[PDB]
């Protein structure tokens, strides 16, 4: 009934987010969907006492000045949390995310064995892309945890915001949160070469400066991880090249062909059973043929190379993953078709074999 | 301050559309389109300020005094909600107040085609409801937001200036932020929206360059974004969005739009042929793979031809095709249907 | 007060403007031309004394901070006035414009009956154009007053500045003065749709933003009035189109062809008697043929349709109006010819075997 009990239940019930707003009971997001708790609806007095109970006095003043506040806090013996407090219809409202210290393993996440091998790469650019909540941070956290476990190197992450904490194991891990630890991605990236890193996570490739920063890191002997909100390997490569002026795109294509070591495009789909989510992932691992196609500006022909790189490189097109999920009845036909980038291709391959 | 409450009660009881308060005239109510003065003495400058200020918050009174303009909404328990505009004329306060029903109308009550219901089922993307002021945009948006609220277990956040339709929680969590009270501005609300775990976001009118980039970012990162524009057609809407950006960034914006656009609705309310009420005429564009290439290929005007043949497959409909059907079914007069066609000669060919 | 007496003489003598400046007697503008009053020339002491006699303490302080001041004021039993005070050659100077409360009728203004029929339009765009002091606000005030009399609708005006005041009749009339009631045309037009209007006066079509606002008003079921400074219907339509980029001119021409309901272009000419001025006006009322010519980018061919549209559509070219002013001997031959856009056509009209 208080903030401590709600946050403990959020962790205990495997929720990702707790929502507190007027005229609704506390609600928790489990596997992406909100489920209300068996409690009376809150009023404006309730949402204010609950949200204020986890703020410092200085934080309460800054929220009252702007009607907005981002913060993080810890509950001893429980978990860390990300909070956002705001105002709607004249009342306090809040959303609170658990940030787990412990990452589940690759097999628990449904990630193919090639993801474990990407975590062993000495150098290059590895891109994990997809929409919000498609599993990107969990894959990145699993990869970084394997690196942390296996290497004696320096890992620096720049995140907006940090979604997983990595205690030091064999690596030295420094994590900078945008907006608190560092002013911006640009400022962190301006000094990242002066911090003796070996592995760097740069977050979303939001602008040209960040793309150039990720390419330089990957060219100078570092393992660079970044995200995009693209849905396929080809769409990912096109977005990176096409954001640059036409005159500088030849160099970017040449740069990408040398340093790119893997592209993972994930999506979480509803299970046909109606409970839980299943991972759909497109995997592109560059071979000499794909690297030439990038340099030759034959980006779209990379898809044909992914269709035949399953046994050799662990590649898998998005349609090839949906096909396997369909034969095992993990997703319905309606969900698979609404997600296929080419439903006619997936339809024809289902009829044969 | 209790006189204003009684005037609005009289406005509701007499079936009026709008209440007018201005100096040197009695309160006037629009009934069936025509103004009628109430049998009361005329107001002075003190009165129009006193009545209008009685329904303002202290901030709203300081916001109004800073700009000599103010839009707002408020509710009267047991009566109705109302949208108000207060302004200044000849050195005195004036006000107009419209009626906002508590009960949100259905798709069929609003005259919205079944394709709007399928747009309400989209999991992510950008859906634009456009038109000039009072073209039914908030009513259409509320119907869309009410269907998602009814059907989904997701988090809906709206940013409104002001909040018009209220959406009680159903199966969704719905948070509605009013600019100038709950949040300082659209810019400030959008700065924090990514930390609030939203699934569906209403950002209001695409009023400037900065909000459009924010709306494209929300829709690109896996969210369903609703926004409005002032344009009157799908093609005019797409051109307006791209052309506000500097020439060097327009290639990316067209590329983003080809990926993220999920629907364009351009509405307009016309008087009914019976002489009572207004009926919705709507142009609906839902991008298919063909339209997405036309967007990427910068052949935006050829999109109109695609809408003419996408009715059965995709539920598409040009404005002229909608006006033709409303005219044949006797919902509108010939002058109103002709007075709205963007190409009156095309509608003639369909008439034959 | 001498100032009280000067303003009474200005009103009584039908002057439009009173001028007070150093080394000249007070001068009043009568029929567009300045005429000095039979008084000794004023000095700097006089001009500061006369202008300060009508200022509040707050106005005197603001004028002294900038050497500029706009204001309006009323004189009980006389008239209201719009004033401007400034400084020149180290001395105070002032100009004062009268704002009449009473609007003259259409026939008094010399406006043809077709203008009255334009006031009965339920929707569309009606443009009243001409140079400064060509009677535009006066024509607009007569139209607004007829609408106010005949309709139960909401009239909103946005003006820079307000020229005629309209007491309520059957309409509710709200008049917003730029720089006092509202910050700008842009802000008034930003909220005008939320103000439940039926008839809107938007002032000068100064930029694309205002033209786009008027087109939106005219398309959504409103009657919109606006002004330009063009001298003919064809010149008026082209001026509106040519303000847009070349790629967007097709749409603007298409919009105008749909919503345009009337174009009036005026000029005030001296009378043959030497007293008063007579209105010369060109009237274009769009028919289906003219609307097509607009859409087809055949604007110059619109004039030929106007030459034959008096009886059918109530149209009237400038030359046809000048012809009528010449037959009634209201203007001299030189004045009529000096304004004709085509003197040879007007000559042909005068040398007619069907002349009567």
Numbering used by the authors:
A (entry chain A): 2 to 354
B (entry chain F): 1 to 352
C (entry chain E): 2 to 357
Which passages does the manuscript contain on this structure?
PilT is the PilT/VirB11-like ATPase that powers T4aP depolymerisation. PilB is the ATPase that powers pilin polymerization in the T4aP. Adjacent packing units adopt one of two conformations: open (O) or closed (C).
The isomorphic low-occupancy and high-occupancy ADP OCOCOC PilT structures have an RMSDCα of 0.6 Å per hexamer. The RMSDCα of these two structures with the methylated OCOCOC PilT structure is 1.9 Å per hexamer. Before symmetry was applied to this map, it more closely matched the methylated C3 symmetric structure of PilT than the pseudo-C3 symmetric structures, suggesting that the slight asymmetry of the latter is a crystallographic artifact.
